[PDB]
Amino acid sequence: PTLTARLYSLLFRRTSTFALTIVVGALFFERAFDQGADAIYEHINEGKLWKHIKHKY
Amino acid sequence: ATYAQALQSVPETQVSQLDNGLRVASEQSSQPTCTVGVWIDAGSRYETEKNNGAGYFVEHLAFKGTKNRPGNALEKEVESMGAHLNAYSTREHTAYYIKALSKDLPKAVELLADIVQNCSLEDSQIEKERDVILQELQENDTSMRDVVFNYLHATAFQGTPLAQSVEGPSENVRKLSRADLTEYLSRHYKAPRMVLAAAGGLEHRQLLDLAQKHFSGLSGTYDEDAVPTLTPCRFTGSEIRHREDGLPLAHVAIAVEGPGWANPDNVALQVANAIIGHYDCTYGGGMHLSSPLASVAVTNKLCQSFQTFNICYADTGLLGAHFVCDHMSIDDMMFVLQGQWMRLCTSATESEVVRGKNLLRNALVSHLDGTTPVCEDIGRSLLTYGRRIPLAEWESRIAEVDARVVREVCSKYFYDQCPAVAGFGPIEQLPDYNRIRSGMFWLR
Amino acid sequence: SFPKYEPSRLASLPTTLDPAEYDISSETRKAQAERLAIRSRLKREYQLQYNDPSRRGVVEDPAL
Amino acid sequence: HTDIKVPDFSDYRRPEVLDSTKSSKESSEARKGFSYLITATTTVGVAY
Amino acid sequence: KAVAFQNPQAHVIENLHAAAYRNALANSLYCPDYRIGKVTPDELHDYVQNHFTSARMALIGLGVSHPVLKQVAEQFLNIRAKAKYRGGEIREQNGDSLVHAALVAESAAIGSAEANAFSVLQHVLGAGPHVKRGSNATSSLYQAVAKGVHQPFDVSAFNASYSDSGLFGFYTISQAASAGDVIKAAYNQVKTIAQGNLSNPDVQAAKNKLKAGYLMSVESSEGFLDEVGCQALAAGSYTPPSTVLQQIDAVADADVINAAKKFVSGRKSMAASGNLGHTPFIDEL
Amino acid sequence: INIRKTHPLMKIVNNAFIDLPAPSNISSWWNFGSLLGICLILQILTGLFLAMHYTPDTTTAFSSVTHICRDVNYGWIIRYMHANGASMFFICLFMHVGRGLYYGSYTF
Numbered sequence A: 001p002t003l004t005a006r007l008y009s010l011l012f013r014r015t016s017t018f019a020l021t022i023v024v025g026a027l028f029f030e031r032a033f034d035q036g037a038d039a040i041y042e043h044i045n046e047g048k049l050w051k052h053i054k055h056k057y
Numbered sequence B: 001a002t003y004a005q006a007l008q009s010v011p012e013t014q015v016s017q018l019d020n021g022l023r024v025a026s027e028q029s030s031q032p033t034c035t036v037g038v039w040i041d042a043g044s045r046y047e048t049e050k051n052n053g054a055g056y057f058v059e060h061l062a063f064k065g066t067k068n069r070p071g072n073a074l075e076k077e078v079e080s081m082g083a084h085l086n087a088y089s090t091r092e093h094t095a096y097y098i099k100a101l102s103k104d105l106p107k108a109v110e111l112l113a114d115i116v117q118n119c120s121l122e123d124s125q126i127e128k129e130r131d132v133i134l135q136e137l138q139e140n141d142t143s144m145r146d147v148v149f150n151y152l153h154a155t156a157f158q159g160t161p162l163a164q165s166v167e168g169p170s171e172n173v174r175k176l177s178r179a180d181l182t183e184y185l186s187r188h189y190k191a192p193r194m195v196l197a198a199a200g201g202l203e204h205r206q207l208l209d210l211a212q213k214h215f216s217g218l219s220g221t222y223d224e225d226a227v228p229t230l231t232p233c234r235f236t237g238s239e240i241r242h243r244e245d246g247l248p249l250a251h252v253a254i255a256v257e258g259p260g261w262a263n264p265d266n267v268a269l270q271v272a273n274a275i276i277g278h279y280d281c282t283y284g285g286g287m288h289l290s291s292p293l294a295s296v297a298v299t300n301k302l303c304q305s306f307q308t309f310n311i312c313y314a315d316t317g318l319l320g321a322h323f324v325c326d327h328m329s330i331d332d333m334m335f336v337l338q339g340q341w342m343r344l345c346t347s348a349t350e351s352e353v354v355r356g357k358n359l360l361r362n363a364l365v366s367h368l369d370g371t372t373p374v375c376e377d378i379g380r381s382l383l384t385y386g387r388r389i390p391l392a393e394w395e396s397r398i399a400e401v402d403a404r405v406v407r408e409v410c411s412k413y414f415y416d417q418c419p420a421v422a423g424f425g426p427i428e429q430l431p432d433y434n435r436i437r438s439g440m441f442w443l444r
Numbered sequence C: 001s002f003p004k005y006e007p008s009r010l011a012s013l014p015t016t017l018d019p020a021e022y023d024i025s026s027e028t029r030k031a032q033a034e035r036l037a038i039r040s041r042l043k044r045e046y047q048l049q050y051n052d053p054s055r056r057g058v059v060e061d062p063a064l
Numbered sequence D: 001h002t003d004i005k006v007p008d009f010s011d012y013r014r015p016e017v018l019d020s021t022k023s024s025k026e027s028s029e030a031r032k033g034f035s036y037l038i039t040a041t042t043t044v045g046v047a048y
Numbered sequence E: 001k002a003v004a005f006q007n008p009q010a011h012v013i014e015n016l017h018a019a020a021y022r023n024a025l026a027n028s029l030y031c032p033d034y035r036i037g038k039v040t041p042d043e044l045h046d047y048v049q050n051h052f053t054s055a056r057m058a059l060i061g062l063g064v065s066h067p068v069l070k071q072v073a074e075q076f077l078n079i080r081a082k083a084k085y086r087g088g089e090i091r092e093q094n095g096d097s098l099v100h101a102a103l104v105a106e107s108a109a110i111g112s113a114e115a116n117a118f119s120v121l122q123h124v125l126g127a128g129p130h131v132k133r134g135s136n137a138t139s140s141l142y143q144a145v146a147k148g149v150h151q152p153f154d155v156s157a158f159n160a161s162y163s164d165s166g167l168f169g170f171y172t173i174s175q176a177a178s179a180g181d182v183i184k185a186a187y188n189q190v191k192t193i194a195q196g197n198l199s200n201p202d203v204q205a206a207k208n209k210l211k212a213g214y215l216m217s218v219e220s221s222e223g224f225l226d227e228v229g230c231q232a233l234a235a236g237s238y239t240p241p242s243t244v245l246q247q248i249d250a251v252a253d254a255d256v257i258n259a260a261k262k263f264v265s266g267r268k269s270m271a272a273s274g275n276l277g278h279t280p281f282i283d284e285l
Numbered sequence F: 001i002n003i004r005k006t007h008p009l010m011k012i013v014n015n016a017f018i019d020l021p022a023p024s025n026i027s028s029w030w031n032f033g034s035l036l037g038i039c040l041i042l043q044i045l046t047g048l049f050l051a052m053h054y055t056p057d058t059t060t061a062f063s064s065v066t067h068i069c070r071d072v073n074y075g076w077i078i079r080y081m082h083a084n085g086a087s088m089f090f091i092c093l094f095m096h097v098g099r100g101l102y103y104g105s106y107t108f
Ligand code: HEM
Pocket: F029, F030, F031, F032, F033, F034, F036, F037, F096, F097, F100, F103, F105, F106, F108
């Protein structure tokens, strides 16, 4: 938890650094969740979707 | 002129150590009126819950007789020599001093020794002083400010004996015997930890001679290793409120962390208290006052009075505000207090730090006048530093303060801290603790 | 100059840094003396019922 | 008021301010970091 | 006015000085209630005119030299009675479980060996306690009252000194139904001291008390400023404390006995306030 | 002193929302009024989108709704949101009425 302490001291003191942190984290979280959503949605079916019979056709 | 040379012309406190671990200190000045005192590091912080109120009761029976001159011969001789005796005891320190003349000095030191070490204890005395001190507690359940400080310490240092008061709870006081007081005298009043300090027209070697007569040959010998040491006190940070709706005024105190004694953070927070500090409603020129908190509190009539203040203790302390106000203006008083705090934190400008430096110089110099406050500062400094640092170095440490270090310390000790909030009286319109914590920083 | 040695259900606290052996109460020394008195009486009666050459068998521990 | 002190909150506190000898200085940072990390993660979720 | 008169003793002082003078020493330090808002700037201007003259100004400097302050005072200062004794009483029902009775006659002017004798007299009768939470092992008034009434009380002497006149007496903070025994015990104690029962070591102890109190009065440099300024404006010039203390402890005992005789035999004035259901008025005193 | 206490909008907002004296012993049953307000603004927003894509003509109404559900991007989620938000509006409505009769706030 010592790593969490310097995390507080770097990214939760003021408003500008906090706001830049939550904006950059929101964009990276967008990126990661959209990749995870694509992976799970095209991983659960594997025999129905448009992808496999859009490259085989 | 030659004010820097005037700070160079400040007399120096000759400090030495007598062989029993005694810490002696002297200011040899040109005043025939003198003041001689003994400072003791034994407060209520070393007391337990079944030992609470020990040192207070010892102070009340330190003057009421001894094995040498019992009952009333002490008072008769001192009032026959015109000296004024005074004593106080705190949670951390206890002082006994005599304000006298240069030709009453050796009898004063000898009777001071007789007061300190030779305390005989009868039982009519413990009965009588028990009754009168319980009357004292009954009467001082009315003086509001000390009750506020007791509530604040009790909610601030929960578990450690720093939360205890000096007098302690009345129930432990009304049930003790001679034995626990005897244990207090045998354990705490010890020659290695006591300081003899004096000021006035008297030589350092003369006071050395008087100590070599009287204070050479004291106890100087502990019990079976049963010795106190400063445990690091656990400041919780919380709030207590005593709602009682029969009072005309309301008393609200708030406090945050302390610097202790060693760091120059204490100097910077004294600069902060010189910025705000005290205001009472018996002043003049209120609509044009320098402190903007006082400006708003006059222009809109917020409170009756306030003071923002420092209290320090061994490696710790409390720092904050105490105000007396009507119940209809608690919220705006607290709102403008948070506004002034955050204006000092985020916007430490030029002229306010200039005025704080000048006000703290003025406060220190006005504190150093009279033999008793100077010798008292000597005794408590040697129980908090081991040295009386002279005023030129004080001026140097003041001159090493800029607004940048000010807002560094203000970010360190004000910016979203966990406070201690004590409310007393008609405190219906006290703002809620989570709202106060949300108001501890404004993001804009 | 250390993380001050956290104790745990395996982390046995050694008798050097207690730190309760710093602000010792006089009644705690009295408790230590009473503990010495208990061990003194028990080992005294052990050596009574133990060194007897007239005795033959076991020590007959009531506590076990 | 001399008879007035607190009841214990040992049932409620976090283990860092549990012992009566440990200071509240170092226990501030990780506590503030945990709570404000929860708030910032909630903020990122609501914003997305 | 509210802040000042939150204490009863301010009312005691003001109604006492209203009770001893028909004249200018019976003025108040504070404004009355009906005069609030009923003042003129015209009286203020006339007061500034004929009171702030160049003849009534004392400029003292502690920390600055003579000629600089002297030159500033030259450059910027070019701008240019006998209160009789009333006699009697003032009684005010206040009812706060604190009976306050101040018993005061007229003593002497300011700056005299007779004023030193009245100061020695009040140090004989009893002053403020030398020991905090002490038990006052010298004041025979304290001992006679504690012999009499076993209640928490307050018996204190009092000496106001002024240019034209001056007041001496004592003052009691006592119980509701236990005031008269305290006051009459103090009265007969002062009578039996005035008979000629004066102790020479008590005289020397009172000399110690007066010397110590006057030397401790100039501990603060603002207090020393006050002493120097009031002495240089009252008696014309400052005098160092050596010969002043010499004339303090060079007074006689017959001065003290005759001063107590003047006090008791003189006609008394008094200020009584509180729940006064058991207060001896005049003829009982 | 305070912008919130001198500006006339923030006076009403302060005495209705921030410094409103409310009791303290409240379970989830008093959330329903705020939920009715949120459903109010949400249903107004969905109806606003629908009125930006709907025609009230009996020849073309059904085909216009089909155009919303199929041709218009996310018009199907907005139609379903308006309908099921009306349904949950009635749910919160009857829960609020049942609360007002059950705890006995009907004296007002
Ligand atoms: C039209 C939809 C309604 C809206 C938007 C609405 C709005 C509100 C709001 C915001 C509150 C305060 C917060 C709360 O207690 O939940 C409230 C309370 C209340 N409403 Fe309504 N309300 C509605 C319908 C009704 C109806 C139909 C009644 C019954 C006649 C009613 C009676 C009450 C009562 C008695 C309270 C106070 C409940 C208490 O103090 O415990 N409301 N309403």
